Amino acid sequence: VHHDGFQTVKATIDWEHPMFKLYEKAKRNGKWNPADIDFSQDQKDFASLTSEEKISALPLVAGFSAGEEAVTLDILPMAHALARQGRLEDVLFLTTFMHDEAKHVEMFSRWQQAVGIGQMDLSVFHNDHYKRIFYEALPEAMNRLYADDSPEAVIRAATVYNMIVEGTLFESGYYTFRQIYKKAGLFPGLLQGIDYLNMDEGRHIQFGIYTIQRIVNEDERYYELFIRYMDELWPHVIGYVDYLTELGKRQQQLARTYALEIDYDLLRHYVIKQFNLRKKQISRTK
Amino acid sequence: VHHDGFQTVKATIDWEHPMFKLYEKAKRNGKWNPADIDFSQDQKDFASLTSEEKISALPLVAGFSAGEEAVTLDILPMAHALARQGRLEDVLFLTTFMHDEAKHVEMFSRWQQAVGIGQMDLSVFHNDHYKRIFYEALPEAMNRLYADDSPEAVIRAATVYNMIVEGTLFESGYYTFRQIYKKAGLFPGLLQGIDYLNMDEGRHIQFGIYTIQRIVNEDERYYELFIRYMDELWPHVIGYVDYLTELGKRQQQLARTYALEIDYDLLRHYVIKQFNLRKKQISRTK
Numbered sequence: 001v002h003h004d005g006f007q008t009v010k011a012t013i014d015w016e017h018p019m020f021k022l023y024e025k026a027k028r029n030g031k032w033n034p035a036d037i038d039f040s041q042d043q044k045d046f047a048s049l050t051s052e053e054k055i056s057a058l059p060l061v062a063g064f065s066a067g068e069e070a071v072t073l074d075i076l077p078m079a080h081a082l083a084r085q086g087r088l089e090d091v092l093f094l095t096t097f098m099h100d101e102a103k104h105v106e107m108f109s110r111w112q113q114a115v116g117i118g119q120m121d122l123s124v125f126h127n128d129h130y131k132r133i134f135y136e137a138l139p140e141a142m143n144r145l146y147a148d149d150s151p152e153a154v155i156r157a158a159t160v161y162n163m164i165v166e167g168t169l170f171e172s173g174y175y176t177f178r179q180i181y182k183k184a185g186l187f188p189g190l191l192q193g194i195d196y197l198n199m200d201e202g203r204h205i206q207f208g209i210y211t212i213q214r215i216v217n218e219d220e221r222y223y224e225l226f227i228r229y230m231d232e233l234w235p236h237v238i239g240y241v242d243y244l245t246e247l248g249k250r251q252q253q254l255a256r257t258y259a260l261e262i263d264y265d266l267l268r269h270y271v272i273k274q275f276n277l278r279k280k281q282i283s284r285t286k
Numbered sequence: 287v288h289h290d291g292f293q294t295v296k297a298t299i300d301w302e303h304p305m306f307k308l309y310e311k312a313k314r315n316g317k318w319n320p321a322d323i324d325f326s327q328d329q330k331d332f333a334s335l336t337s338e339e340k341i342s343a344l345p346l347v348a349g350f351s352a353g354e355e356a357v358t359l360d361i362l363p364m365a366h367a368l369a370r371q372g373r374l375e376d377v378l379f380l381t382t383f384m385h386d387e388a389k390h391v392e393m394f395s396r397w398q399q400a401v402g403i404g405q406m407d408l409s410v411f412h413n414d415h416y417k418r419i420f421y422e423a424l425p426e427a428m429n430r431l432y433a434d435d436s437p438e439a440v441i442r443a444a445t446v447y448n449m450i451v452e453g454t455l456f457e458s459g460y461y462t463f464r465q466i467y468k469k470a471g472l473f474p475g476l477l478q479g480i481d482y483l484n485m486d487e488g489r490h491i492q493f494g495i496y497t498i499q500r501i502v503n504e505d506e507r508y509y510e511l512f513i514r515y516m517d518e519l520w521p522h523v524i525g526y527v528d529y530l531t532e533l534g535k536r537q538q539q540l541a542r543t544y545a546l547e548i549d550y551d552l553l554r555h556y557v558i559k560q561f562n563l564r565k566k567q568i569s570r571t572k
């Protein structure tokens with residue numbers, strides 16, 4: 001449907017808008033290029049691994065590649081909904097969000113190619129709970145926005161996308177990967193990639209917090225909605241975590257070899273901790 | 287609706303895809319930031335102008351600010367349609383397309399703020415023909431893709447967006463602005479902005495050419511469709527050009543003052559020339 005007018009012809013960008021300020025930061029700090037990462041050492045490292053050390057790494061890489069791909073694709077409806085509501089600064093910021101995700105998908109896919117598992121189908125490490133979140137709930141909640149951009153639909157989208165997928169699962173997965181492979185001294189290029197990624201994702205969660213909070217601010221009721229959508233997903237979050245935990249426990253060599261005490265009961269608590277932490281960034285009134 | 291799987295878990299990005307290669311170039315050459323442009327001289331220049339020299343510049347700025355805003359918003363459905371068709375490399379490239387446009391809107395809006403016309407409503411320089419293209423035909427053709435992503439709907443979208451708006455009108459408008467204000471020595475910051483912009487837009491047109499050509503390649507019939515949608519818009523293109531021409535002719539001082547022979551009959555022929563040129567980049571068979 002038509003345009004009514006244009007904000008930058010009638011007025012200007014709102015230079016003080018919190019999302020314009022996040023946009024300015026995204027440009028300043030968003031310069032990294034996955035094509036510049038030297039993966040030659042990751043290649044040698046992965047080859048040097050035994051065939052069962054090799055698979056120890058792959059479940060997490062399978063959850064991330066798919067994860068980054070899904071969120072690259074599934075942010076588009078948010079951008080549309082907010083655009084149609086006239087929230088131009090939000091939209092400007094979301095262009096950097098989307099391009100960041102594109103680079104995240106790119107980065108993992110380059111790592112897979114370079115270490116020589118590009119031809120390998122990693123779908124086999126997505127259990128039913130992973131599919132529920134990434135193959136199903138994430139795209140259902142975002143796509144809904146094309147026909148329903150009610151406060152309730154926008155809170156639920158930002159909750160599933162930003163608070164659970166990015167704010168709980170990805171955050172914990174970055175922590176985990178660094179806890180394990182940084183201590184072993186493995187996969188320097190990938191870890192460099194993860195670090196850049198982790199920095200981008202700091203902005204992304206700030207958009208979700210801003211979005212959920214500005215809706216909650218209109219009406220307290222929406223707070224209980226937020227808490228509820230969080231608790232609804234939790235079973236699928238921990239059920240993916242158990243599945244991974246249980247995979248990694250039946251492969252103990254890399255932990256033995258590189259001699260790393262993978263405290264699964266410490267990772268598990270980080271997930272639990274991230275989740276509660278996200279709840280605390282939304283207040284019933286603010 | 288659900289995801290079936292993920293290309294970067296089953297396989298990798300198609301590193302040889304023409305849109306992945308355009309994505310890589312966009313990252314390398316897409317580093318400019320409008321926030322870094324020094325507009326202090328543009329401010330002094332605009333103040334130094336007489337009040338009727340001042341308005342000589344504004345119609346074109348009004349067509350561009352709105353123009354950049356519209357295309358920032360109206361590329362989203364293309365990204366969605368291609369995403370839903372599984373064209374991941376296209377989508378990656380389109381993240382850079384969208385962010386480029388965000389910066390284009392940003393750049394003009396900064397120029398308006400800096401020269402002190404930010405509070406001025408420039409909508410008054412959008413005649414009926416401009417509205418037909420930008421307020422109406424552009425968003426109708428893009429949004430259609432949400433419900434109809436037939437070859438025919440995708441060709442028409444790329445034609446209106448990339449071949450007419452960007453490939454004909456914007457291209458000509460950049461040429462014009464540089465023909466006039468570069469020769470006068472005015473508005474150095476804006477021209478710097480326009481130059482960066484013109485470089486980004488080289489990639490954008492290559493996506494539209496790629497998109498139209500890959501559809502035409504399936505079936506010659508679509509070529510006549512392409513030519514026809516081009517010819518349908520032309521009246522609105524030249525009717526905006528006459529309106530501008532006719533504005534600039536009833537303001538002759540800046541042309542007198544800065545002593546520039548604004549050959550309107552040379553600009554007019556550039557528009558005609560860009561248009562035919564775009565037709566020639568699509569072949570009935572290739």
Ligand SMILES: [Fe+2]
Binds near residue numbers: 071101166201204
């Ligand atoms: Fe993210």
Ligand SMILES: [Fe+2]
Binds near residue numbers: 129239
């Ligand atoms: Fe289960």
Ligand SMILES: [Fe+2]
Binds near residue numbers: 357387452490
């Ligand atoms: Fe463009």
Ligand SMILES: [Fe+2]
Binds near residue numbers: 415525
């Ligand atoms: Fe007319």
Ligand SMILES: [Mn+2]
Binds near residue numbers: 068104197
């Ligand atoms: Mn990401």
Ligand SMILES: [Mn+2]
Binds near residue numbers: 354386387
């Ligand atoms: Mn542009």
